[PDB]
Paper text:
Herein, we provide high‐resolution structures for an EAL enzyme Bd1971, from the predatory bacterium Bdellovibrio bacteriovorus, which is controlled by a second signaling nucleotide, cAMP. The Bd1971 domain architecture is predicted to consist of an N‐terminal cNMP sensory domain (cyclic nucleotide monophosphate, postulated to bind cAMP or cGMP), a middle linker region, and C‐terminal catalytic EAL barrel. C‐di‐GMP turnover was increased ~8‐fold in the presence of cAMP or cGMP, further supporting the proposal that cNMPs are activators of Bd1971.
The crystal structure of full‐length Bd1971 was solved with both cAMP and cGMP ligands, to resolutions of 2.63 and 2.46 Å, respectively. These two co‐crystal structures are effectively identical other than small differences at the ligand binding pocket that are discussed later. Bd1971 forms a butterfly shaped dimer measuring 90 Å tall, 90 Å wide (at larger EAL domain) and 40 Å deep. Bd1971 dimerizes around a long helix (residues 340–357) and a shorter helix (315–321, referred to as the compound helix in BlrP1 or repressor helix in MorA; Phippen et al, 2014) that follows the catalytic aspartate pair (Asp306/307), and can thus be assigned to the “open” grouping that correlates with active enzymes. The dimerization interface we observe is centered around Ser348 and places Asp306 and Asp307 in a productive orientation, similar to that observed in other (presumed active) EAL dimers. Superimposition using the cAMP ligand reveals many shared residues/structural features between Bd1971 and CRP including the classical base capping residue (Bd1971 Arg108: CRP Arg123), phosphate cradle (Arg67/Ser68: Arg82/Ser83), and ribose‐coordinating group (Glu58:Glu72). Due to the relative C‐helix swapping, the hydrophobic base capping residues (Arg108 and Leu109) are contributed from the opposing monomer in Bd1971 and the same monomer in CRP.
Residue numbers in the entry:
A (entry chain B): 6 to 110, 139 to 401
B (entry chain A): 6 to 115, 139 to 402
């Protein structure tokens, strides 16, 4: 709601309590101090500008007095509205705000890790490993997923729990992601060449390299174009490249409603990773041109003990079939789990039972 | 990533371009201005404090010079790190930042508007009593009996002429005014439940009265807010009602949290409140949690129901939700039902309950009390 005010009206004085702040819609206002009954002007504010906001942010008194130079109309910003928005803001953005207030009158660790990660990337401490995906019935290796690893010389082998999230919600996903795709496709060509070299011509034609693509780099412009360049750079075919995505992409939709269709039109397979976790698929599933979905490991490890977690999984498999989507059950660590998973009708699987993620040299041996 | 610096080294001067900012790990530093080769000190910064951040935020030159008073070690904050975090921040929080920069610089030398206004307009309307509750019948699909109702919030005003009238519900739900408004909703809904049950007993429909369920929408904020279950219990006892007749409709998004929100539902369930997941299959998905949550109902959203007959794989999604629900002793309420053909398919797939225009639109208490009697 908006409020009219008379010329020369002292709206509030220096030292008052801070109920709310204002945004000027019409008119002009003067901010001033008072010292031994001398009146020193700080500035004149006009249309679009704000005042009374400092007291609300740090719960202290009015740093100055304010008087209307003419008839003005103000739009009210409440204390709760300000604190609400300041509290949700990033911890560094809050540091920045607080320090600016003081002067006008873990964050260190978070900043250092982001730079440590990026420096490691440039010192080439990251490399891709590849985990076999197998046909459950005949145990043949049908394809693989590219997984990012980091082994610093000083901190040994690093947990991906740490760096993956940090990378994904930063702009460094673009240069890193480009490197991931390029490396994964380079090694696909090498995999197919080795397969043809040992006269496994049909296995070579059906081989699928799964690459994880995050939201940021998907929604980023010129993605499909740069992807196509990298594909042609290694003389590869679209039917051997499968893009693993989180459900969350369809929250957006400026380019992200038909970007998938543009990917699908070129022959790239699209797969929904960690289905049944995070943003919900069931409606997103009727929209999206999906060829696969992956049943997360959290489901698979409760199949034998929890009998209604089994029911959830059975239902996902049957639903998937009903829309010509195929299933990859991941996290498989015991033969008994595979048995149930095949009886329920899941075609593919991946997990420790078959193979952990390994480097390209161990993987090339595995396929033979 | 961390950098050592010599005593008396001018790290940067006033008027330079701003490549990066620094955080002091060791030592002390002096910020100063220069005027006709007079050096006026602004302050001394020490361990843990920051400098060089202003130039990065608004792309302008260094407002001052900086010199190390002793041997110091600095941790670098890049421009990209700062802009990255500032850009994602709320539009008002960005306004606040930019205005503070302008005033500090001058000091030592000498849609967001619309979102904010609508929030206050909504709250003023609430206090001027422009809101009221309507009630939409939920029916048993097979025998068409009214089994219960959902309380729906209305705003009787031309200004609420959004016509896509969800909007204000969303504005309320993601604001702190959900607490005083929500309290009013719950109180009003429970008051009218007592009136519904009294009429039902008055016409010797004793069994229908015992099975009647009033569905109330409860948002995340007020659910996660402390002292919720206690205040709910007070309002229930205020109207002499039983927990088995009160059903709480919740969005899936609550299980993102879990400090209080894994067992808050169990604390509600322990008291006998039915819990229902509204708009299931939209927004967040608590599937790995849905084996855990004490859920008695879920509602198939209208967006699914209106595509059942045209889109044959939207039908498959709905069939699958119903079968899954049954497999964990959860019952289904299909909403948005506007044609008899939809109800047919919905009953064949096995959904027990329904609500929609086919049966009845939302109406005031009054038209609802008449509706029961048929
Ligand atoms: N140096 C300044 N330049 C411009 N505006 C100021 C200055 N100091 C204070 N203000 C504004 O005047 C207000 C006085 O009360 P607050 O501290 O609540 O919020 C203050 C600012 O919005
Ligand atoms: N009044 C002040 N009090 C304390 N520090 C300041 C003040 N003015 C500027 N600074 C710091 O000195 C730095 C000079 O360059 P920047 O403008 O990039 O960033 C500035 C702030 O970090
Ligand atoms: Mg993956
Ligand atoms: Mg509802």
């Amino acid at each position: 709601q908006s409020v009219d005010i008379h010329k020369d009206q002292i709206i509030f004085s220096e030292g008052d309590a801070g109920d709310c702040a204002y945004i000027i819609e019409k008119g002009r206002v003067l901010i001033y101090l008072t010292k031994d009954k001398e009146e020193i002007p700080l500035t004149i504010l006009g249309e679009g500008e704000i005042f009374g906001e400092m007291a609300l942010i740090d719960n202290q008194n009015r740093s100055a007095s304010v008087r209307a130079l003419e008839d003005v109309r103000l739009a009210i910003v409440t204390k709760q509205q300000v604190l609400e928005r300041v509290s949700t803001a990033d911890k560094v953005v809050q540091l920045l705000m607080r320090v600016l207030l003081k002067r006008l009158r873990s964050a260190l660790d978070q900043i250092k890790l982001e730079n440590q990660i990026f420096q490691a990337f440039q010192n080439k401490e990251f490399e891709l490993f590849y985990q076999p995906i197998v046909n459950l019935k005949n145990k043949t290796i049908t394809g693989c997923e590219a997984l990012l690893r980091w082994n610093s010389p000083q901190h040994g082998l690093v947990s991906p729990n740490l760096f993956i999230d940090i990378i994904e919600n930063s702009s460094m996903v673009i240069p890193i992601g480009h490197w991931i795709i390029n490396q994964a496709l380079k090694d696909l060509r090498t995999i197919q060449d080795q397969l043809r070299l040992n006269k496994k011509e049909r296995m070579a034609d059906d081989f699928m390299m799964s690459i994880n693509i995050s939201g940021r780099q998907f929604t980023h412009s010129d993605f499909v174009n740069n992807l196509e360049d990298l594909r042609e750079k290694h003389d590869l075919h679209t039917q051997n490249i499968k893009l693993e995505m989180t459900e969350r992409i369809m929250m957006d939709g400026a380019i992200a409603i038909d970007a998938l269709n543009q990917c699908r039109s070129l022959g790239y397979a699209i797969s929904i990773d960690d289905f049944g976790t995070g943003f919900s698929g069931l409606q997103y599933l009727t929209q999206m041109p999906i060829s696969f979905l992956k049943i997360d490991r959290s489901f698979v490890m409760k199949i034998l003990s929890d009998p209604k977690s089994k029911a959830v999984v059975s239902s996902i498999i049957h639903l998937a079939h009903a829309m010509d989507i195929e299933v990859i059950a991941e996290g498989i660590e015991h033969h008994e789990e595979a048995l149930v998973l095949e009886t329920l009708g899941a075609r593919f699987g991946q997990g420790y039972l078959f193979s952990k993620p390994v480097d390209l040299g161990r993987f090339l041996k595995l396929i033979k």
